[PDB]
């Protein structure tokens, strides 16, 4: 179990760690989050009390280094930083742990939610979508645009998700125009899986990361990517059986975790109705269809 | 974006453009089977591809053999339309290729966009105008070449005859759409109007009769009356 200490909390802020959140008051003696499960990526995230504009946060994996949070009064945000002195940091954690100035990652033993949401998410792949190679952790916020959004403006602050475009030469083989547009199997299986992602685990990892950025930061381009990656599978007549079964589990836990009150903005009616009711895979997502019908029947 | 009453003069500027109408591509007769079920029999069709400035018509005849052994023919017909339009563009010299293609039915947008991916600078546009190009098969010489075709064939016409020697493109297109709207609303009456006077003939190299300017005014007035009438005979007014 690992720890991210906090130097101080000088401004009032709602702090998230994965699917959990807690409010910290201005100058409250908060000094971090302990008992963080090893083996998964995590995200610590922030929304200031005075300006709910810009949710922002950091993806990290405690196996890769010792990370801590300190407020920068010049840039006006909580920043993640890596400490190389393993003794200086251990002294920081043990001292604050003795003073009980840390919240405990509040995982219920029965509860596999976070594993299920991050099963295929790897820090190494996050660091390629979010390019800042001098750090081992990755900053994301509400406003960051995707490479695809930019083509349609600062490159260094972009989300480099894999570009998916159903009306593109990449997606459509010359001479197979109608075939490839109505059945996206060659674009899914040859172009994307075999060519770009190499395997379904990396594809699902990017789909899962896009969803999490959509949910935790309201990142609109991430929501576009999540839906595009769903649609590309559902619109393919030929998908390996293991991928369809895994997709149903992935989406089930995403829909289960989504705040009920954000479905209006984070769920695209067209994609979901097409995916569950019209597409080739309309009968392959039983768990996802059942939760969607019972939790968001309005959208459908 | 969409072509409408507001940007109508754009049709007659000097940027090459083509209308594409697919409503006569897949044509069938519905009939009963010996067992009393219903079946369709395809007949030859055509793509109606028209330069509204110059009157040049690229009539691609769709022979019934293209449907043999195919499923979902009404969907396929849109993709076949887009395939043939793309092939026509590629066949034209660069300086003759259109800058815009306007489809008369919005369901042609995605098929045509996908087939034209190699031409990113050709705009594919819908229209809000309800154009009467379905009535093209009421023009006897066009219907005749489509029905007689024994294989796929492209036939080139000028749908304005020699009208552009005397009138502008705007006026020519207005006359064409009036004639076609009339043929669409009451084909029998329209054709009676066009041929009632046996001394006015259709030149071998033309589609419409050789009316003088004054006779065209009479003809055009007769077509308007027909359209308004039928509009009354329809809604009872
Ligand atoms: C430039 O000063 C860097 C001080 O480094 C720290 C500051 C605050 C906290 Br919480 C933890 C550390 N740490 O692990 O050393």
Swiss-Prot record, chain A:
The modification Phosphoserine is found at residue 236. It is found in: Cytoplasm; Nucleus. Disulfide bonds: none annotated. Phosphorylated on serine and tyrosine residues. Keywords: Cytoplasm, mRNA processing, mRNA splicing, Nucleus, Phosphoprotein. The modification Phosphothreonine is found at residue 257. Residues 244-265 are annotated as: Leucine-zipper. Present with 7330 molecules/cell in log phase SD medium. PANTHER family: A1 CISTRON SPLICING FACTOR AAR2-RELATED, PROTEIN AAR2 HOMOLOG. Belongs to the AAR2 family. Component of the U5 snRNP complex that is required for spliceosome assembly and for pre-mRNA splicing. Involved in splicing pre-mRNA of the A1 cistron and other genes that are important for cell growth. Heterodimer. Interacts with PRP8 (via RNase H homology domain and MPN domain), competing with BRR2 for the same binding site. Component of a U5 snRNP complex that contains at least the U5 snRNA, PRP8, SNU114, AAR2, SMB1, SMD1, SMD2, SMD3, SME1, SMX2 and SMX3, but is not a component of the U4/U6-U5 tri-snRNP complex. This is A1 cistron-splicing factor AAR2.
Curated annotation (Swiss-Prot), chain B:
Functions as a scaffold that mediates the ordered assembly of spliceosomal proteins and snRNAs. Required for association of BRR2 with the spliceosomal U5 snRNP, and the subsequent assembly of the U4/U6-U5 tri-snRNP complex. Functions as a scaffold that positions spliceosomal U2, U5 and U6 snRNAs at splice sites on pre-mRNA substrates, so that splicing can occur. Interacts with both the 5' and the 3' splice site, as well as the branch region. Has a role in branch site-3' splice site selection. Associates with the branch site-3' splice 3'-exon region. Also has a role in cell cycle. Component of the U4/U6-U5 tri-snRNP complex composed of the U4, U6 and U5 snRNAs and at least PRP3, PRP4, PRP6, PRP8, PRP18, PRP31, PRP38, SNU13, SNU23, SNU66, SNU114, SPP381, SMB1, SMD1, SMD2, SMD3, SMX2, SMX3, LSM2, LSM3, LSM4, LSM5, LSM6, LSM7, LSM8, BRR2 and DIB1. The gene is PRP8. It comes from Saccharomyces cerevisiae (strain ATCC 204508 / S288c). This is Pre-mRNA-splicing factor 8. The MPN (JAB/Mov34) domain has structural similarity with deubiquitinating enzymes, but lacks the residues that would bind the catalytic metal ion. Contains a region with structural similarity to reverse transcriptase, presenting the classical thumb, fingers and palm architecture, but lacks enzyme activity, since the essential metal-binding residues are not conserved. It comes from the Eukaryota. It is found in: Nucleus. Residues 7-237 are annotated as: RNase H homology domain. The chain holds residues 1836 to 2069 of 2413 of the full protein. Present with 468 molecules/cell in log phase SD medium.
């Amino acid at each position: 179990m690992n720890t991210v200490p906090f130097t101080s909390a000088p401004i009032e802020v709602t702090i998230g760690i994965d699917q959990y959140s807690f409010n910290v008051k201005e100058n409250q003696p908060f000094h971090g989050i302990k008992d963080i499960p090893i083996g998964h990526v995590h995200v610590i995230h922030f929304q200031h009390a005075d300006n709910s504009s810009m949710r922002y946060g950091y993806w990290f994996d405690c196996r890769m280094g010792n990370f801590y949070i300190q407020y920068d009064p010049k840039d006006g945000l909580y920043k993640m930083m890596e400490e190389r002195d393993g003794a200086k940091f251990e002294n920081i954690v043990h001292n604050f742990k003795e003073r009980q100035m840390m919240v405990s990652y509040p995982k219920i033993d029965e509860d596999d939610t976070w594993y299920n949401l991050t099963e295929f998410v790897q820090m190494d792949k996050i660091r390629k979508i979010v390019r800042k190679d001098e750090n081992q952790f990755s900053y994301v916020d509400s406003s960051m645009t995707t490479v695809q959004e930019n083509e349609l403006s600062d490159p260094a602050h972009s989300l480099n998700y894999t570009v998916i475009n159903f009306k593109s030469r990449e997606a459509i083989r010359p001479g197979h125009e109608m075939e490839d547009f109505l059945d996206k199997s060659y674009y899914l299986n040859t172009v994307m899986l075999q060519g770009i992602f190499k395997n379904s685990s990396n594809y699902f990892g990017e789909l899962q990361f896009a969803f999490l950025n959509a949910m935790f930061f309201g990142n609109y381009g991430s929501s576009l990517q999540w839906h595009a990656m769903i649609e590309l599978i559902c619109s393919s007549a030929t998908v390996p059986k293991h991928m369809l079964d895994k997709l149903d589990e992935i989406l089930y836990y995403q829909i289960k975790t989504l705040p009920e009150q954000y479905s209006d903005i984070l769920l695209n009616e067209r994609v979901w109705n097409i995916c569950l009711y019209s597409s080739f895979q309309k009968n392959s997502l039983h768990n996802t269809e059942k939760i969607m019908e019972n939790k968001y029947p309005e959208l459908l | 974006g969409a072509m409408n009453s507001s940007n109508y003069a754009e049709l007659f500027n000097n940027d090459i453009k083509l209308f594409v109408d697919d409503t006569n591509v897949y044509r069938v007769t519905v009939h009963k089977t010996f067992e009393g079920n219903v079946a369709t029999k395809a007949i030859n069709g055509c793509i109606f591809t028209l330069n509204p400035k110059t009157g040049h018509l690229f009539l691609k005849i769709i022979h019934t053999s293209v449907w043999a052994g195919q499923k979902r023919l009404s969907q396929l017909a849109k993709w076949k339309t887009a395939e043939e339009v793309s092939a026509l563009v590629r066949s034209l010299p660069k300086e003759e290729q259109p800058k815009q293609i306007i489809v008369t039915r919005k369901a042609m947008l995605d098929p045509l966009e996908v087939h034209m991916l190699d031409f990113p600078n050709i705009a594919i546009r819908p229209t809000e105008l309800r154009l009467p190009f379905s009535a093209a098969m009421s023009i006897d010489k066009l219907s005749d070449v489509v029905m007689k075709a024994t294989e796929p064939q492209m036939v080139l016409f000028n749908i304005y005859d020699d009208w552009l020697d005397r009138i502008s493109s705007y006026t020519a297109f207005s006359r064409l759409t009036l004639l076609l709207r009339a043929l669409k609303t009451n084909e029998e009456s329209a054709k009676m109007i066009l041929l009632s006077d046996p001394t006015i003939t259709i030149k071998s190299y033309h589609l419409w009769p050789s009316f003088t300017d004054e006779q065209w005014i009479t003809i055009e007035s007769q077509m308007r009356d027909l359209i308004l009438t039928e509009y009354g005979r329809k809604y009872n007014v």
